[PDB]
Nucleic acid binder design. Structure first.
Length: 184
RNA sequence: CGCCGCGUGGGACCGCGCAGCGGGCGCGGCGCGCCGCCGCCGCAGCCCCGAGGAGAGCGGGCGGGGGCACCGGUACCGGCC
């Protein structure tokens, strides 16, 4: 019964992560808030560039903000329990296709947050929930292949210098764009 | 035969869509949709952003800008000693 945190039947990786989450409520290491009946949905095993492969943990969108109240406590604990992976929390928000859906009688329409442009920007924020993006210039270079550039404060740069490689490669998985990062 | 007709395709550009969905019942009078009815537990259910557009606000100075009342100063002209 590893069913207390995730959902359904999955591959080997998620069950071990579910175990860390079961002890995680038991350990009150700054994670008491929200945890106790906080549940997850899926994990993405993504091989990130040359860095240790960083896996993603899709967390249900209603329970995303409460889960990430102290996001640091989730990532550090997770790494110690399952070394080799820099885990990243992402809400499973969904893009709805068709801005208006016509049933003939009425056009039901799509909400704004369910669109690719709205979803992608919200994905970057989950990759760096503690650090707010200073700016997101896009470089469409001379030889084609647009690359997203993200600017963050230099104060947090020393910490996220190491974790930028896992973040850029995972966002390449979530979004086709060749995202790259820079600091002020 | 200019054909603003029609048929099929495309859907960038161009405008334009207020209403919640979805499941089941269900083969609703040869198949279906209606049309209901039940929270029925399946939806991240339901907000682009915030124009060196625009209106509104507060603050702080700005000016022979407008009105209205009051008024002072010589000068010109007139009447005096």
């Amino acid at each position: 019964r590893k069913i207390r945190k995730p959902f359904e039947k999955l591959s080997e990786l998620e069950k071990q992560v579910a175990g860390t989450l079961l002890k995680l409520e038991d350990d009150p290491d700054l994670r008491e808030m929200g945890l106790g009946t906080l549940y997850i949905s899926s994990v993405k095993e993504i091989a990130v560039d040359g860095d240790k492969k960083a896996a993603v943990v899709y967390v249900p969108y209603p329970m995303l903000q409460s889960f990430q109240k102290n996001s640091e406590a989730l990532i550090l604990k997770l790494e110690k329990n399952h070394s080799g992976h820099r885990f990243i929390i992402v809400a499973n928000r969904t893009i709805m296709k068709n801005a208006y859906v016509f049933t003939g009688k009425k056009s039901i329409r799509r909400p704004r947050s369910r669109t690719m442009t709205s979803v992608y920007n919200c994905i970057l924020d989950d990759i760096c929930y503690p650090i707010h993006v200073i700016g997101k210039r896009t470089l469409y270079p001379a030889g084609s292949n647009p690359r997203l550039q993200v600017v963050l404060p230099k104060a947090v740069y020393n910490e996220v210098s190491e974790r930028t490689k896992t973040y850029s490669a995972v966002y390449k998985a979530l979004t086709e764009r060749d995202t790259e990062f820079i600091f002020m």
